[PDB]
Amino acid sequence: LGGRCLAFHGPLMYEAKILKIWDPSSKMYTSIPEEIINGKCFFIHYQGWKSSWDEWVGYDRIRAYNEENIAMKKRLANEAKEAKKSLLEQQKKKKL
DNA sequence: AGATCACGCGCGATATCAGAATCCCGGTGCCGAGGCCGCTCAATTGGTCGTAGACAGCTCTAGCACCGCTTAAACGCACGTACGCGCTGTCC
């Protein structure tokens, strides 16, 4: 509770802080979409964003705040920007 | 080669998907304002006396006015150069 974590949104990562941890067994959260209500999900406030973007995320969309996940986030950002540059270059080439 | 139609790209406008901040509407508790009461000090009433200001007469200084010359300064004109202003790009 309150620890730092990395969360999925699209093909990119975003640093977030856990505000609520949901325990489906006891039906309570320590301080919900049906597809994650059954399992242990977490309410997270994303670093660098407003409270309006706070959301519940399951285990699939979350990762521990470690070196490996930070590096994987950096790789995702790098491949995303590379893809955008490639798409722009392809459009430019198609234009001539 | 030129004109018309269709497709693609670029730009403008509206909408919108949102989400952000502000304004608004309602309930609530408050304390700040308006009011009444009592007391007293400052304003009003009455009177005096004296000097400050109002008024008339006179004086003469200064303001106004006028004229005429002469000549410093304003007005006018022209060339041009350098400063204002617009546009553009970069960096912070």
* Resolution given for this structure, in angstroms: 2.8
Task: Give the contacts of A57 (CB within 8 A, at least 6 positions apart).
Answer: A7, A8, A36, A41, A42, A43, A44
Cβ contact A90 with chain B strand, < 7 A: no
State how far the Cα of A32 lies from the Cα of A42, in Å rounded to an integer: 10
DSSP secondary structure string, A15-79? EEEEEEEEETTTTEEE---HHHHSS--EEEEETTS-GGG-EEE-STTEEESSHHHHHHHHHHHHH
Task: Give the contacts of A69 (CB within 8 A, at least 6 positions apart).
Answer: A6, A13, A63
| A31-CA/B91-C1' distance, Å | 47
Please give the distance of CA A94 from its chain centroid, rounded to a whole number: 34
Q: Shortest CA distance to A19 belongs to which of A2, A37, A40?
A: A2
In degrees, to the nearest 5, what angle opens at C-alpha A46 toward C-alphas A58 and A20? 50
Q: Are A56 and A9 in contact (CB under 8 A)?
A: no
Give the phi and the psi of residue A90 in degrees, each rounded to 5.
-65, -45
Q: How was this structure determined?
A: cryo-EM
Cβ contact A52 with chain B strand, < 7 A: yes
| A54-CA/B40-C1' distance, Å | 72
